[PDB]
Amino acid sequence: EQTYFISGANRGIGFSVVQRLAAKSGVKVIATARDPASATALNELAKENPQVKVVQLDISDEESIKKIAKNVSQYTDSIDVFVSNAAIAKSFGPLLNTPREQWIEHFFTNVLGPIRLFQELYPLIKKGTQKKVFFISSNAGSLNLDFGLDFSAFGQSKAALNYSTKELARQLKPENFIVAAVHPGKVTKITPEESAAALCKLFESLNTTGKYLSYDGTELPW
Amino acid sequence: EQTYFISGANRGIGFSVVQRLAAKSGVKVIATARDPASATALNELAKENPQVKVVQLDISDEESIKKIAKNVSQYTDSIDVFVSNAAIAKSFGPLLNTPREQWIEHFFTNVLGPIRLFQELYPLIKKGTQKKVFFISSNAGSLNLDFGLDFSAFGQSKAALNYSTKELARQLKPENFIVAAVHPGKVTTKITPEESAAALCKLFESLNTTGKYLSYDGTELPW
Numbered sequence: 127e128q129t130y131f132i133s134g135a136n137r138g139i140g141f142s143v144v145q146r147l148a149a150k151s152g153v154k155v156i157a158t159a160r161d162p163a164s165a166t167a168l169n170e171l172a173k174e175n176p177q178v179k180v181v182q183l184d185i186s187d188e189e190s191i192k193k194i195a196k197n198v199s200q201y202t203d204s205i206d207v208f209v210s211n212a213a214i215a216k217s218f219g220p221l222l223n224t225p226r227e228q229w230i231e232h233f234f235t236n237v238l239g240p241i242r243l244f245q246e247l248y249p250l251i252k253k254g255t256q257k258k259v260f261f262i263s264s265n266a267g268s269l270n271l272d273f274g275l276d277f278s279a280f281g282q283s284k285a286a287l288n289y290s291t292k293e294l295a296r297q298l299k300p301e302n303f304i305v306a307a308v309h310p311g312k313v314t315k316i317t318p319e320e321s322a323a324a325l326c327k328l329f330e331s332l333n334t335t336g337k338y339l340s341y342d343g344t345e346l347p348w
Numbered sequence: 349e350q351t352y353f354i355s356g357a358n359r360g361i362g363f364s365v366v367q368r369l370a371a372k373s374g375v376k377v378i379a380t381a382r383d384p385a386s387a388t389a390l391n392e393l394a395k396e397n398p399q400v401k402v403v404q405l406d407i408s409d410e411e412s413i414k415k416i417a418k419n420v421s422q423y424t425d426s427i428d429v430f431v432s433n434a435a436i437a438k439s440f441g442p443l444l445n446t447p448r449e450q451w452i453e454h455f456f457t458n459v460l461g462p463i464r465l466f467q468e469l470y471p472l473i474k475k476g477t478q479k480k481v482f483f484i485s486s487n488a489g490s491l492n493l494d495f496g497l498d499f500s501a502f503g504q505s506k507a508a509l510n511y512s513t514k515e516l517a518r519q520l521k522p523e524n525f526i527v528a529a530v531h532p533g534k535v536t537t538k539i540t541p542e543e544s545a546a547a548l549c550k551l552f553e554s555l556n557t558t559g560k561y562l563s564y565d566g567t568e569l570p571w
């Protein structure tokens with residue numbers, strides 16, 4: 127049996143990924159929401175598929191991160207595949223029009239949060255078999271793609287997590303970890319369920335660390 | 349007549365850049381220190397070259413950044429060449445080993461600081477002739493270079509600011525701004541603060557196109 131950790135599973139790509147993993151046999155899923163009590167569809171999935179364990183996590187909240195290791199541990203001794211999917215996208219457009227608060231909130235939720243979350247959960251991941259570590263990033267975070275769009279604090283947060291993900295891939299190569307940053311697509315437009323089907327196949331198959339990948343398995347430049 | 353603005357001019361490259369400009373014919377220089385009152389080299393520099401103006405700036409401190417345009421406005425109608433030089437470099441090595449505060453301090457000092465600084469001085473830069481914007485970055489900030497080192501919060505912060513620098517260049521291109529990310533070199537191969545300064549002042553004056561990521565010598569770096 128394999129255990130997957132997905133942050134931000136209450137909706138979007140995250141929910142579709144949990145819904146996709148719940149169908150697979152022998153996949154325990156630790157699914158997080160800021161507010162489980164309100165996570166109607168996730169909770170109904172967990173009611174039907176007890177493979178699916180729901181836990182609270184606010185990745186902006188250090189006090190929430192300080193508890194995620196012990197709380198995930200109640201449901202599993204190990205994590206095979208870790209997915210940092212929870213993230214905000216609330217700041218686009220020009221630098222001069224981006225208030226301080228937006229830079230900060232993208233930093234805390236999109237950069238420090240995934241990093242702290244990986245720090246807290248690394249031990250559980252070390253004790254797993256797959257040792258796979260995915261940060262759901264964006265093609266917007268690329269330092270070398272031009273979309274002729276301003277991504278402001280959003281893109282800046284994804285470039286930052288990209289930089290530290292590539293560094294992490296190097297640090298955990300000797301421990302036989304697979305680390306990737308993955309663009310889940312434009313949800314050309316695709317549905318969250320399409321994204322999750324592609325993402326899930328990618329999680330399964332990827333067998334080399336340090337990749338910046340799109341959902342379809344092709345590579346993006348950092 | 350040109351106004352240069354330089355953050356962190358009390359020591360390091362920043363002092364060496366201000367020292368060189370203060371010898372330059374018809375150049376006014378707003379130089380910043382966290383603590384003007386103990387920036388004794390720079391106070392003597394401005395005493396001996398009063399074209400040099402010393403104002404308080406803590407780029408980690410939003411209250412300090414909220415005052416910079418008024419502080420700068422005391423001495424000048426405009427900024428021709430803006431240099432975000434002030435910055436920290438306190439955290440390297442593995443992710444698992446980088447505590448929360450190092451990631452936080454490098455974001456606030458090395459990313460938000462320069463963004464808020466530029467937001468505050470853009471009206472004065474807009475009013476100037478040269479419209480030249482330099483963020484002192486690092487080669488460690490590249491997403492496409494491998495020095496066989498991890499740079500932790502430091503590298504992340506330079507990469508972060510690098511992303512926004514590139515965006516700012518796109519955004520201000522039609523306002524005829526020249527925006528550049530510039531690696532000043534590894535300063536005391538090792539080079540001297542005065543060598544860095546000399547090469548930077550040369551780049552500051554000759555740089556004609558925007559959106560570039562440059563080393564001190566004027567070679568391009570990959571984003």
Ligand SMILES: NC(=O)C1=CN([C@@H]2O[C@H](COP(=O)(O)OP(=O)(O)OC[C@H]3O[C@@H](n4cnc5c(N)ncnc54)[C@H](OP(=O)(O)O)[C@@H]3O)[C@@H](O)[C@H]2O)C=CC1
Nearest residue numbers: 134135136138139160184185186211212213262264312313
């Ligand atoms: N959709 C797209 O086109 C693209 C998306 N992405 C990436 O895809 C991932 C998910 O996107 P998508 O499903 O569309 O996003 P949604 O906005 O649909 O949902 C985001 C998820 O993140 C959770 N989340 C947000 N803030 C926090 C927080 N502080 N603590 C914990 N959980 C939080 C949300 O919970 P809550 O309901 O509580 O807000 C939700 O579960 C992200 O990593 C994003 O960066 C990037 C490229 C393109």
Ligand SMILES: NC(=O)C1=CN([C@@H]2O[C@H](COP(=O)(O)OP(=O)(O)OC[C@H]3O[C@@H](n4cnc5c(N)ncnc54)[C@H](OP(=O)(O)O)[C@@H]3O)[C@@H](O)[C@H]2O)C=CC1
Nearest residue numbers: 356360361362382406407408433434435485486533534535
């Ligand atoms: N120099 C190098 O070899 C390399 C460094 N860089 C870049 O070059 C820049 C210049 O380096 P250098 O001047 O020698 O740096 P130093 O290491 O000597 O010190 C940092 C400088 O920034 C100031 N400073 C630090 N923190 C703050 C703050 N919170 N608010 C305001 N000012 C602050 C310091 O003033 P104070 O005395 O008060 O601390 C000092 O002038 C760096 O800041 C960095 O971005 C990048 C690549 C290589």
